[model samples]
Target: TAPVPLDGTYRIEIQRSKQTYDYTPTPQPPDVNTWWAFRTSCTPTECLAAATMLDDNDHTQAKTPPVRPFLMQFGEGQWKSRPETVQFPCVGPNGSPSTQATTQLLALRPQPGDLVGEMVVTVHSNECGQQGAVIRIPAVASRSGDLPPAVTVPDPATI
Candidate 1:
């Protein structure tokens, strides 16, 4: 389990990562927040969720491969401590059949760089118990180059 201080945009490579759960690791167009951007979407408050892909099936064959309208939500509890089955609000994102879906956090660890991390989430249908998929997210919340000025200050003084 690799713990990271939440927040930032991480990079993902489909060809290199084989990150296929909901959707294959296909390159994404800029601005759609592809590659997995885990920034604060709301008030760091009660809960949160974001739209993403709905794989586990090549819905793309229908000529509609895209990010679903709900990627995540408040899991069993705070993500500070990894849990067995992370929970979501719906049975599945993108109009799935399940009424309640569960997310199992596979591998989560901080990368070698600053504010960078990687994690794999295995989502399955908790209600009907049919559909299942995996999503690999390698991300960067903050780069060393973007460290705060205070942290980079030469000394305690000079003030």
Candidate 2:
């Protein structure tokens, strides 16, 4: 397996659809739904992130909610690269306290360029009956700049 280029600024490609839901359920449909960015930056091999579950493409909420390294957020899900596929892990707290997620980097290259990948987000909580429901999110990426210092080291969660 080839190692992925681990020093690129990954810009998560945004989705156009919005599926609004009453996640906070209070007799009426609440203003909560699934829509966010799973963007990040990488080190020699691993990556760090915060708020993988981004809100609005323009980042209107403007709150770095809370993010961490791939391992810190999830488990020890490392980012590995092969000729055909790449496996990278990230975190997203869509509506729960914390949700672990992973992305399959398709045709991931060692160069700074465009990349396409797929991810499945499982709601992790007891309050919602939708727990464990697998939601697929497709995104893209490219080599641009560097990741924030927060996601670059030991305190990947701190920003």
Candidate 3:
């Protein structure tokens, strides 16, 4: 495989603020919501998968290791929320719309810092994500690469 250059580098910053969207007493308890937080980018990052270190015969001696590409750095904070799972999409920039993409789910956490009472981020994806269109995107229109900026976010108030 080879690397294709594209214009899409995103920065994932860890900001621990008592950010509350809905005006609720508890605010549903903030969770790591990457569902749509970071800016848009278009990097064909490799998704990390598990490496099968075991043969057909099940043996504890042979243990397979799981791998997800990219590592995030913890800035500084006491993560109000522990490391948890969040899912994102992976597909070609211009791939078919209906074509199912290879989705990547990552576990996130806040490393070291002073957080009075909030969530602190700790992982800036340089070789990984904060992305938009997939670099080697094919000739179709899947929601992955071509996730239009306009429709990406919705102001429900306007709805």
Candidate 4:
């Protein structure tokens, strides 16, 4: 496979499963249509990428969640993210401790001006009492200019 261009801002759409649990016991929560902007700067062998959640209008306003930045490396004709851990408030009533979620981008294949990948999110055990769970989200990204500026190296301070 030819080398894919991995050094631009991309607008991504992720379709979350309707059958997933996310802070509630309701089994029938509707599917989530989440959007994100990923900005990256890359060398021949690796890329530094940052993720920003977008609102319904596809804009990053003040209310949008903070950025989640990660690193990707080229191998076997694909670009994959090194697993990154993030914390979130646990489910149920207040005062519960936070839980860790491990996220990773896998098998990012390059198209003419797009990318396709799978985003894996794993929630670890926490005060919520769930053992563990994994959600595989299908992601499609297109080139865009709406994201924050890409950085040469992912900043540790921002994480």
- Most TM-score-accurate candidate: 4
Cα lDDT tens digits, model 1, 21-114, are 5554665532223222232244545444332222234322211344423233444432222335666554322345445455654222333544
> Could you tell me how far off, in angstroms, the CA of residue 29 lies in candidate 2 after the best superposition?
17
List the candidate numbers ranked by TM-score, top first: 4, 2, 1, 3
Q: Which prediction has the highest lDDT against the true structure? A: 4
- lDDT string, candidate 4, 28-117, tens digits: 445455555665666665555555565566454422345444445556766677776666556533444666454544557777778887
Span of 10 residues, lowest total lDDT, candidate 3: 135-144
Flag regions of model 4 displaced more than 4 Å.
Answer: 1-70, 92-107, 145-159
Cα error, candidate 2, residue 38 (Å): 14
- Candidate 4 residue 4 Cα shift, in angstroms, is 67
TM-score: which is higher, 2 or 3? 2
TM-score of each: 0.28, 0.28, 0.16, 0.44
- How many backbone collisions does model 4 have? 0
Query: Between candidates 2 and 3, which one is better according to lDDT?
Result: 2
* Candidate lDDT (C-alpha), each: 0.39, 0.40, 0.28, 0.57
lDDT of 2 by residue, 63-148 (tens): 25544222222224333322222222333334334333323322222234555544544544434334455565454454444433
Candidate 1: global Cα-lDDT? 0.39
Residue 23 of model 4 has an lDDT of 77
- Those runs of model 1 whose alpha carbons end farther than 4 Å from true positions after fitting are 1-81, 89-98, 104-115, 126-130, 143-159
